[PDB]
Design a protein around this ligand. Structure first.
Ligand code: NO2
Ligand code: NO2
Ligand code: NO2
Ligand code: NO2
Ligand code: NO2
Ligand code: NO2
Ligand code: NO2
Ligand code: NO2
Ligand code: NO2
Ligand code: NO2
Ligand code: NO2
Ligand code: NO2
Ligand code: NO2
Ligand code: NO2
Ligand code: NO2
Ligand code: NO2
Ligand code: NO2
Ligand code: NO2
Ligand code: CU
Ligand code: CU
Ligand code: CU
Ligand code: CU
Ligand code: CU
Ligand code: CU
Lengths: 332, 332, 332
């Protein structure tokens, strides 16, 4: 009887940060309430000033990470304001039935809807927009995110012992297909609808023009680098709603990795690089052992360093010479 | 002594259906006899009427699924009628030696051959044509299928308890590379041999023009949608002989998945999407919990919705509001 | 106290062969000393005489396989002679900190450096060059290899019983992006630096022109085919520093496979084909059961047979008719 369950309202935060939550459930099953507003907006995606008409959940690419526990109910109020121009909906890979909620959430500009589903399977899962006839266009314009459904007793290692993270980040990786004129210059459009047939043609090449973390080349660098300290346990959730990726922490490892993101399976240990298939979210747990700058990349290094799929961690603490040292510094 | 073993003759059926078989072996080891006839035929692959010269086992793309048990012998009579124009053969990834049988099965038009091999490893496996010097051309013209070698005691879950399916379907996914003229229009040819050098050039782009299930855009829709009922346990075998794919059931999950298709390994649990590498068959087990239409796709959504890699399930039964419900239907 | 540990100097050998080592460690932890010299050289990569300016560790593509045990220290002397023109460095995915050693190993022509790191995680791992601003160019010009860190008690199967190999080979798979003029002819350059902007443009297509094993189309064929005997246990280490691959032994299997190469995980059993993600090394163990020629390929068969990613094994011994036999040889 759902009306007897506690309700809790969560305010979402912008990626790569994640809203507050408990790893081990401190209550019984709850109805967890979320609100997202759809925003179509112009986004500058690279250093050259290339602009696209992005389609977003809550103003960001990716959409925010939602966190619940196994056998909670998720109740999402989805708002499509009349300042938008397109029909949108939402499909949760975490959910069972009705195209993951897609069939029940079709909202025209000026409409809203509220969907409830039971989170029956633990793991990280993609969510994305999926309107009839225009699915890849919405998804590859940025309209995707992820949801984490934790086991009620938190994460476990391959021997079933508790794994507790100190920090959690969400990296959403996005393949964009910006249309090009004859010479290879990127085209510009006044509205999302103008771009449609050119977008379809660009998509059919299967060759992205940009592949980015958190919505732009360089978004997770500088003042926006991810941070940690030596000794901290970090969980990095990574999603790709459309195309395969192969994350790698340069200078580190994935100590425990759920590459296809489903926590009832034992983690893979000591990964250098792992494959997250398009349409999947994965999670990797690492304990930092050395300070300094780390690069977190898609390890197709062209996709990383030429197309944009690279971010940074900045890690503070003590250097350990037993793990690595320069014996003879570069010299003639 | 093989002559003392029972022989059983199996008549194959057209994909996505599968010939009758027992999950748990009701006899000792047998010699299982199959016959396939090679057919080169014109195939219309999309809604626009694009035609290719397909190269098929038994008239279909994919070729039919063959089902045996571990330590059966498979005896295949392979016929290449004199109405064909090309040399063909067959390579079974299930088999050991002689290029998977490829070295022993080279048949010119007007010839036949009979190969026997022992099915020593349990799993789903690709089979495909592989003639010297023209391997990818035959395979990417449709000349591939799969064989399932069941354990003698049937399938097991991650804890070694029996898993029994009520229905089984075979989805063969095919990447086609249709040659294009200068402006991007698909070319037509009178015979398979005319297309050869143009086919090689189209293949070398590594960019398929079409990616389809069961031989055509829309083949597993409408009257040809896959069917099931709420509560039924369905095994979906999926093969890709040349290129990676990432299957996803829209509105469902892979409850138990052997993504690389080999049943001595424990299944992965609760998959949203899984990667089947090119040259592999995989299998996913799901119990339907909600009625309605489901889409089964390659979750590179461009490959799905623009290039053709999407089919439907139509599921009958009772709707469960505890799993999902519309709380507030789309409204102003 | 590292100064009290034994030191052992290893001389590396050319791929696909591997330097001598013990599977089960016969000593306590050691400092293992290696020397590599960087060589920029012209390489002919295909039958047509296409030449590139390759960037190599120790004169080969891939660089040599280094073999140590878990909790050894690796001390690498890296030499960049003044006959080279570029700055190089080395990143070990096996190592922890400083971009895998990349931040500490930047050597101009005429310089050398010595790096030490502790091999804390068992597995096969990529190493590659990674200079600031030119990472994918160096890697896709051939500047990558692998290192194997064995458990001190050798390899184990899925039940923890010893697995011992009789022979070990290293297959390095390389994606090249040779720039093309307007008509599609490959361009030639006097020096590595001349090619830079054309190389970047060719890389951004994400479409390799060649994909090769051991540095050239046909390199592992003929007199350079890999060899084994019926009954031998062979470990094949395979690396791809930039792009996914899907190895397959034509006529065989992967009996035990670590597709992402990390030995604390149980192996996958009975694989037909497995996916090694770009930026990863994997390892597959097979016992040969039949004599003859086998082809070892990337099972995107276009990449294999058109772009170059195919090699051969030649296996001697006795034919077993119980596993496979021609019942009726091809006839009218
Ligand atoms: O700014 N609207 O796409
Ligand atoms: O946009 N309706 O709340
Ligand atoms: O789905 N493309 O990796
Ligand atoms: O092809 N996926 O990077
Ligand atoms: O080790 N980074 O490519
Ligand atoms: O899907 N389990 O990582
Ligand atoms: O119809 N023969 O390709
Ligand atoms: O085609 N010979 O039976
Ligand atoms: O092999 N291409 O996914
Ligand atoms: O690249 N395979 O979809
Ligand atoms: O959830 N289907 O893309
Ligand atoms: O290959 N086992 O899914
Ligand atoms: O031969 N030097 O690139
Ligand atoms: O190149 N210095 O030894
Ligand atoms: O990273 N390309 O398979
Ligand atoms: O896309 N990797 O072959
Ligand atoms: O079975 N070789 O493609
Ligand atoms: O990464 N273990 O194969
Ligand atoms: Cu949308
Ligand atoms: Cu989806
Ligand atoms: Cu054929
Ligand atoms: Cu094959
Ligand atoms: Cu270099
Ligand atoms: Cu790397």
């Amino acid at each position: 009887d759902i009306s007897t369950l506690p309700r809790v309202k969560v305010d979402l935060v912008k990626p790569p940060f994640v809203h507050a939550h408990d790893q081990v459930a401190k209550t019984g099953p709850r109805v967890v309430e979320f609100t997202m507003t759809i925003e179509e907006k112009k986004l500058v995606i690279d250093r050259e000033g290339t602009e696209i008409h992005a389609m977003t959940f809550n103003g960001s690419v990716p959409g925010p990470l939602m966190v619940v526990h196994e056998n909670d109910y998720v109740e999402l109020r989805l708002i499509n304001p009349d300042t938008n121009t397109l029909l949108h909906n939402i499909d949760f890979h975490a959910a069972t039935g009705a195209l993951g909620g897609g069939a029940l959430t079709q909202v025209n500009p000026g409409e809203e809807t509220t969907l409830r589903f039971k989170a029956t399977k633990p793991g990280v899962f993609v969510y994305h927009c999926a309107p009839e006839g225009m699915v890849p266009w919405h998804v590859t314009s940025g309209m995707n995110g992820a949801i984490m459904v934790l086991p009620r007793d938190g994460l476990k290692d391959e021997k079933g012992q508790p794994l507790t993270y100190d920090k959690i980040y969400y990296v959403g990786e996005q393949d964009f297909y910006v249309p090009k004129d004859e010479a290879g210059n990127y085209k510009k459009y006044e509205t999302p609808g103008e771009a449609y047939e050119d977008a379809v043609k660009a998509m059919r090449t299967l060759t992205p023009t940009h592949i980015v973390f958190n919505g732009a080349v360089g978004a997770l660098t500088g003042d926006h680098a991810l941070t940690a300290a030596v000794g901290e346990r970090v969980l990095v959730v990574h999603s790709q709603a459309n195309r395969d990726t192969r994350p790698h922490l340069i200078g580190g490892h994935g100590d425990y990795v759920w590459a296809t993101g489903k926590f009832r399976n034992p983690p893979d240990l000591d990964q250098e690089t792992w494959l997250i298939p398009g349409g999947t979210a994965g999670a990797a747990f690492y304990t930092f052992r050395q300070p300094g700058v780390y690069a977190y990349v898609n390890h197709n290094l062209i996709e990383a360093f030429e197309l944009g799929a690279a971010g940074h961690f900045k890690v503070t603490g003590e250097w350990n010479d037993d793990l690595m040292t320069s014996v003879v510094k570069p010299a003639s």
